[PDB]
Design an enzyme around this catalytic site. Structure first.
Site, PDB file in Angstrom:
ATOM      1  N   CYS A  35       5.665 -18.044  -0.168  1.00 17.35           N
ATOM      2  CA  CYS A  35       6.410 -19.038  -0.313  1.00 17.35           C
ATOM      3  C   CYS A  35       5.905 -20.430  -0.780  1.00 17.35           C
ATOM      4  O   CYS A  35       5.933 -21.321  -0.101  1.00 17.35           O
ATOM      5  CB  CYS A  35       7.446 -18.932   0.808  1.00 17.35           C
ATOM      6  SG  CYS A  35       8.488 -20.149   0.694  1.00 17.35           S
ATOM      7  N   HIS A  62       5.062  -3.941  -7.089  1.00 18.64           N
ATOM      8  CA  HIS A  62       6.658  -4.036  -7.466  1.00 18.64           C
ATOM      9  C   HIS A  62       6.535  -5.787  -7.384  1.00 18.64           C
ATOM     10  O   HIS A  62       5.765  -5.999  -7.952  1.00 18.64           O
ATOM     11  CB  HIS A  62       7.275  -3.291  -6.015  1.00 18.64           C
ATOM     12  CG  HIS A  62       6.966  -3.889  -4.822  1.00 18.64           C
ATOM     13  ND1 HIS A  62       5.564  -3.243  -4.154  1.00 18.64           N
ATOM     14  CD2 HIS A  62       7.247  -4.664  -3.867  1.00 18.64           C
ATOM     15  CE1 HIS A  62       5.378  -3.827  -2.729  1.00 18.64           C
ATOM     16  NE2 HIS A  62       6.367  -4.644  -2.654  1.00 18.64           N
TER      17      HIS A  62
HETATM   18  C1  LIG Z   1       5.001  -8.885  -0.199  1.00 19.85           C
HETATM   19  C2  LIG Z   1       3.921  -9.212  -0.091  1.00 19.85           C
HETATM   20  C3  LIG Z   1       2.672  -8.243   0.805  1.00 19.85           C
HETATM   21  C4  LIG Z   1       3.326  -7.125   1.317  1.00 19.85           C
HETATM   22  O1  LIG Z   1       3.595  -5.902   0.639  1.00 19.85           O
HETATM   23  P1  LIG Z   1       4.040  -4.596   0.950  1.00 19.85           P
HETATM   24  O2  LIG Z   1       3.943  -3.821  -0.032  1.00 19.85           O
HETATM   25  O3  LIG Z   1       5.259  -5.053   1.570  1.00 19.85           O
HETATM   26  O4  LIG Z   1       3.448  -3.703   2.067  1.00 19.85           O
HETATM   27  C5  LIG Z   1       1.439  -8.755   0.872  1.00 19.85           C
HETATM   28  N1  LIG Z   1       1.019 -10.000   0.357  1.00 19.85           N
HETATM   29  C6  LIG Z   1       2.065 -10.881  -0.418  1.00 19.85           C
HETATM   30  C7  LIG Z   1       1.274 -12.327  -1.002  1.00 19.85           C
HETATM   31  C8  LIG Z   1       3.342 -10.672  -0.551  1.00 19.85           C
HETATM   32  O5  LIG Z   1       4.240 -11.271  -1.218  1.00 19.85           O
END
Ligand SMILES: *Cc1c(COP(=O)(O)O)cnc(C)c1O
Ligand SMILES: *Cc1c(COP(=O)(O)O)cnc(C)c1O
Ligand SMILES: *Cc1c(COP(=O)(O)O)cnc(C)c1O
Ligand SMILES: *Cc1c(COP(=O)(O)O)cnc(C)c1O
Lengths: 466, 463, 463, 466
Positions: free
Chosen positions: D190, D242
């Site tokens: 964030c 993703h």
């Molecule tokens: C979402 C996020 C993750 C976690 O990923 P997952 O695929 O949900 O296990 C790790 N690092 C950052 C910087 C993220 O935004």
């Protein structure tokens, strides 16, 4: 085979002359030289008489209440006596404070507390070494963990402001929130000011940590009421019994007892954790003869003669510091509140590294130490100087002013040898120039003579010239 | 001040009478009693004279040639001398062996080695405590890690066969392959036989581990050549300097130098660094001087003699006890001590150590390899070093066997009045609260103290 | 954009042909070959349809009732449904058992349990790898910790008796007292017999440890009631959802709820916290939907049937191999797989897996309990789940035993041309570089692929 | 028993209707609502088609070069293809960079790197959670270690200046010298601004540490060249596939190859350490169908349609932010450089905690987040809003301005309900007031209707309404 019995009784002088000879030469060296090392002192004759007692022969595991073996009627009397005198000397109420007197030395004592309250890989926060901290408070680099505190626990240091020479409590309060220490250490090896125990305590409670005070360097001043007591705000206080307390080598762990906080109240669990960590945790049989020596030293520490000795110690430091300021030297934090001062030798164009070798050759003992500024650990700028030792020999304010001049003579000499070695020269080479140069070697021989003459005017505490 | 000047000169007797009084009472207790505790001994007068030297005043961080402060000309002479005599006493070639003499005691020494060779959470294997092992070799339960060795490292014990009383080397060789120790410890606190250093060494090399020998209990016997030397097969050997070596309290770490296999040994610097700046601060110089003095005495033929005597007395003591119907663990002994299985008399070491103590006969309880309970240890550990230093000989120890016997009979009696089943606190109550009994003790003690007083008590003239 | 709008709609075939081509070639390879690898299986069409759902798009950190983001009305319905079916399929009372369905795979699941119940450097005991254990149960050498379980925790293995092929429970009971495990793992990768959960449980309770069962290889057999359930004695049971359960790749952690002895179970919250926020991030919802679909199919009688068939085929396959002169480890099997000791034919699993592979018969090498070398494994692990899903029956597997035999004969031949002593790289060279040989393979492969094509290949219609 | 075969072929709709029903209801919910959650996005149809392939059925341990079993001719083609496209998409020279594509997700990937380069109890430094950091970067309190990174390693966070909203690089440079990190993490969950990789790199090299970039949130923007690439200064770069990259759930670890430094030169040893940590270290068989999906997504990520999609993503954020500023909202750091913004709701007298529940009821999805200031974690002041998802549905600058007004309507509504609950009321109670109050419930019903109508005007990527 029959002379074996005449062997266990034969005095040291006859029995082993080679060792006897060494003890004599050392006793003499101690006499004609000027001891300005902040951590050394001279133990009284009584204390030394206890160390060689038949107390060496009694093996006793456990504590007075519960021992592993029997036949401890007198060892219990002794340990108990020692514990009582320790609390008394520092004016502690046995309902609020407790004490363990089995640690073998300062380091062992600190390590026992970490092992009891912190636990493996627990976080500890202490004063950075170059800023006047101690090894047992944690010492590591980016590539290696040197001190045991750093090897078995996770340590991170807090520093002093390099512009004021004082501990930066603000930055520590901030970092503690990010680091989450389980224990914060308040103690120093080369800091001339009093520690803000009250503020450090507010910070400890803020993070739910413990506040430990390692008062090894000022335990003597604390007993004489010459400097604020760390017992007002800390949970634990550790300490060596030599140094300013002037006993034999050993350590002690003081810990709070009773109700810790409310809401309904939770109790202190220090006592059993600490006792268990010392033994069976880290140590074996306690050195009883050392406990007897500590006991004897604690009784002497409560005499008014001692309280006087201590006011004298502090006064000499002030005089020594004032005399050096007048000679143009720069003292870190401007001055001192206790028994020592860190002289920033940059103000004279030299460093403590070369200065300690020249003063040493002249029979003036002390050691180098980095100043808060210092951009290099290989070329420390200061000299740490303490007054406890010389004050025990009877030096007074006027005597220390003469000492200031000897030290000055020394600094002038070391500077002469530095201009003679060169710019990018090495301390390895400097030491060679200092030994294989008649020009410089003559100066030394001369200064040493004046130093040893002056030193001989004062007595040397201990056993009959032994 | 004028009085402060002399306060530091006032002798102990005048200065502090309360402590002086205690030292006297203790010196006396040591005199009229029989010291049969395997770990105690009497240090010579010379050794004690060094401890109270002006060497207490010198602060010397570091090592000879690696000092932190200046003014160590003589402390270097001393430490160096001490190191030379240590290697000499054990017949070690300074090209193949090295030694650190700064450890404060036995425990500290062991801990420094683990910290240097093992590293945090490293695996260590030692003799199980109830089977005669030491705390510093590791001690834990299923719910808690007690010893520091267990708190900072991962320890697992190996046991002795409960049917032979000997260490089960086979099972150790098997478990070592599953546990993968980084260091195996060969040393005991209550084992009367010699350790198979050669076999333990083959096992260590099999798993790439280090073989450390904690010879605290037999360092004296080793110097006199009375029992095999662990220096033939180990990489490291630690030891207290009191106990059988008869010095003051301190420790030493011996380590191999040279070629290991071309691969070289890296022990020296790791071990030196672990002692300081790692774990310790300033070394106790007065203790090093005492150790030095003790090592010189250890090389005299008078000592060699003293030691053969120590072993001889143990044999006599054990033979006299066997004849009185007592069962010795593993049948007998090779060194200075024996574990007497008191089950053969219907009692346990727990009750027996209290009764013998009341009669001025000191010793301690210890579990026998069998023992199905740690709260009711079956044996009594008995050593001869201390009493031998006072001059007892084979015939004297046979008389001692009888006093001990009298004691066992007495402890059994208070036990027959208590009934086959009764807590320990009951037993002690009946011992101290019965005419015929507290009376028995008073009587036996008298005979014990009379016999004891016939022998000298080493040490400083008289406190 | 106008094209970006449809780029996200373009089917895979048009969108990315290079990947599409690969999927086709792989689907075909799966068809004409014989899958005898114990861990592989074919997931049903329905399960695969769920994986590609719009469930991939929903990010839901947390658990039902403990969500971080909003808009989880249906993801909650789904996770909850999945948890209910999991308990149901194994006949568990939700008052006594709980389940976490977020693990990404088998390994992650195991690791989460260790992290929750064991804690850093805690002790874990598992079946030794060469004796049929799994990596996640611990795997290390004397010089290095390979598996994560070994890197973050302190693991020690227990073995099987090399003369019976069975797990030596006695020696484990003994070592557990010396090692003090905080958790004992009961699960295998290459063991053909049922585990004595009751005995392992008595040992766990003896040391105050936890008994975890990693039933990854037999979860399917357990649901069909074809092999004893580990749920009767364990505290925790983890499992992959593919393999015998025949779902998509994912894992589950089952844990006891209620009274442990009045002391209660604290597993639920520790385990839930360890999976998230501890080790994982957002859960793969599409995989949970696939698992849910698979659990419903697992409760049908058609599945119960499928499983009895799986076990039956193994028996037939093993009997046919015994008759052909092969030696089965521990004589036979209780489940879906068997470890064939190829020493009885003068070859090793290392060379044999390469030849059978060339002939389109898939399987893998595995060391036999005896084996004095990990570089020359003696056995071949063979499983029947996969081929049974394609419809093979007892008579079909007997034909398979003959193909495998033909293969072993061929591998032996290339071995007789290489000479009794020859490296593995030589063997392969002679296999691929010889007329009579590469020719033999070509021939056998042809018969294998013809036989294989007679059976259907589950999954989506046709890629 | 004979129908078993008709079971493995039966479509999901017939096979399991209960799950089918759920998938449908979810697909519909996704359609009529406004997805403003920064981490969500819609995967293309092609990517989803790969996930359900027969690739699920192939079990293959190891890597292309060396596998534990045989029959991997095509799985190798696939993994290799995927690795090639990954390096290509980010414009990396395979002689200087490598890639592991087996991680199961973002978290697993990060954990693999720590396990390979850091080792147990090693020190790691990451952005503090309340300041926009991620759990996997470390998360602990004074009494407990929550995240796995904190449980197995020794972590300490660095913060942002609460007056500028930016990362305080100066204070980090200072603390790093005291903490001695073995690895520094540069990545956020964030934070609306670009990270100073070059400065963080200077700090890493100063302490001999490694610089790891967790670009999970901006991997898509990086490929389109819309924001500086972390590949210029980092040693390792991890990422989910993703989120902004718009693929299926999986992770990747990028690592440098070749000569690290000189003097005479030392090499990078990342590749083997990282490969070994993923497997056999932490994982088992790789999810091949997921690798196929990632491969398909990386090809789409290199199309100009994607580069366009991304410029659009950033532009919408600017518009959304500008529209909210005009409506009187305060954006942390004044604005954004990427796809998201942290709206400080204090400027409206409410907090993100109550705001996310009201907006949720109105079918507008997003989440609460603490602002750098925030003196409480139980009453977070901000709302994190991202544009990736809605932009994939085709929204443009003018569309987002309408969204800004819906969000505003929502904030006005949540504020109405807050004045109606009271002063010291609890979020527990607030949620009750929001459900059992027709007065407020009417407002919601109304706003939701306008939101769902607007949302339905745009397409929903993926499979045919499934
Ligand atoms: C979402 C996020 C993750 C976690 O990923 P997952 O695929 O949900 O296990 C790790 N690092 C950052 C910087 C993220 O935004
Ligand atoms: C000297 C000193 C120590 C070390 O004591 P030792 O007795 O040498 O082992 C520990 N802490 C402080 C603050 C000191 O000055
Ligand atoms: C007694 C003994 C020790 C302990 O010595 P301390 O000096 O009490 O610290 C260590 N190891 C062994 C083998 C022992 O017998
Ligand atoms: C296969 C297997 C695993 C590993 O499963 P993954 O899904 O590959 O991660 C774990 N445990 C056991 C007992 C197994 O047979």
């Amino acid at each position: 085979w029959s002379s074996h019995e005449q062997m266990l009784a034969q005095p040291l002088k006859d029995s082993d002359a080679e060792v006897y000879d060494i003890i004599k030469k050392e006793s003499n060296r101690q006499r004609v030289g000027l001891e300005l090392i902040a951590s050394e002192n001279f133990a009284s004759r009584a204390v030394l008489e206890a160390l060689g007692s038949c107390l060496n022969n009694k093996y006793s595991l456990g504590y007075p209440g519960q021992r592993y073996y029997g036949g401890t009627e007198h060892i219990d009397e002794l340990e108990t006596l020692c514990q009582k005198r320790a609390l008394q000397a520092y004016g502690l109420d046995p309902q609020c404070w407790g004490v363990n007197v089995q640690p073998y030395s300062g380091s062992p004592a600190n390590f026992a507390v970490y092992t009891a309250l912190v636990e493996p890989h627990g976080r500890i926060m202490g004063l950075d070494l170059p800023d006047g901290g101690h090894l047992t408070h944690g010492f590591m680099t980016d590539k290696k963990k040197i001190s045991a505190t750093s090897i078995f626990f996770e340590s991170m240091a807090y520093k002093v402001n390099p512009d004021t020479g004082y501990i930066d409590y603000d930055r520590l309060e901030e970092n503690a929130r990010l680091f989450h220490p389980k224990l914060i250490i308040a103690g120093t090896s080369c800091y001339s000011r009093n520690l803000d125990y009250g503020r450090l305590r507010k910070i400890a409670d803020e993070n739910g940590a413990y506040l430990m005070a390692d008062m090894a360097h000022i335990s003597g001043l604390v007993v004489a009421g010459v400097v604020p007591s760390p017992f007002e705000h800390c949970h634990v206080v550790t300490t060596t019994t030599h140094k300013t307390l002037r006993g034999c080598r050993a350590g002690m762990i003081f810990y709070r007892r009773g109700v810790r906080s409310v809401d309904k109240e939770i109790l202190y669990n220090l006592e059993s954790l600490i006792n268990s960590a010392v033994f069976p945790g880290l140590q074996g049989g306690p050195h009883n003869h050392a406990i007897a020596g500590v006991a004897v030293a604690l009784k002497q520490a409560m005499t008014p003669e001692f309280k006087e000795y201590q006011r004298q110690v502090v006064a000499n430091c002030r005089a020594l510091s004032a005399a050096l300021v007048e000679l143009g030297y720069k003292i870190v934090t401007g001055g001192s509140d206790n028994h020592l001062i860190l002289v920033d030798l940059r103000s004279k164009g030299t460093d403590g590294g070369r200065a300690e070798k020249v003063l040493e050759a002249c029979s003036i003992a002390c050691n180098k130490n980095t100043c808060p500024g210092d951009k290099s650990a290989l070329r420390p700028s200061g000299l740490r100087l303490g007054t406890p030792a010389l004050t025990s020999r009877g030096l007074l304010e006027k005597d220390f002013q003469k000492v200031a001049h000897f030290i000055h003579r020394g600094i002038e000499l070391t500077v002469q040898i530095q201009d003679d070695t060169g710019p990018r020269a090495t301390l390895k080479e400097f030491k060679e120039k200092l030994a294989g140069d008649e020009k410089h070697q003559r100066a030394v021989r001369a200064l040493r003579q004046e130093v040893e003459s002056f030193a001989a005017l004062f007595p040397l505490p201990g056993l009959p010239g032994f």
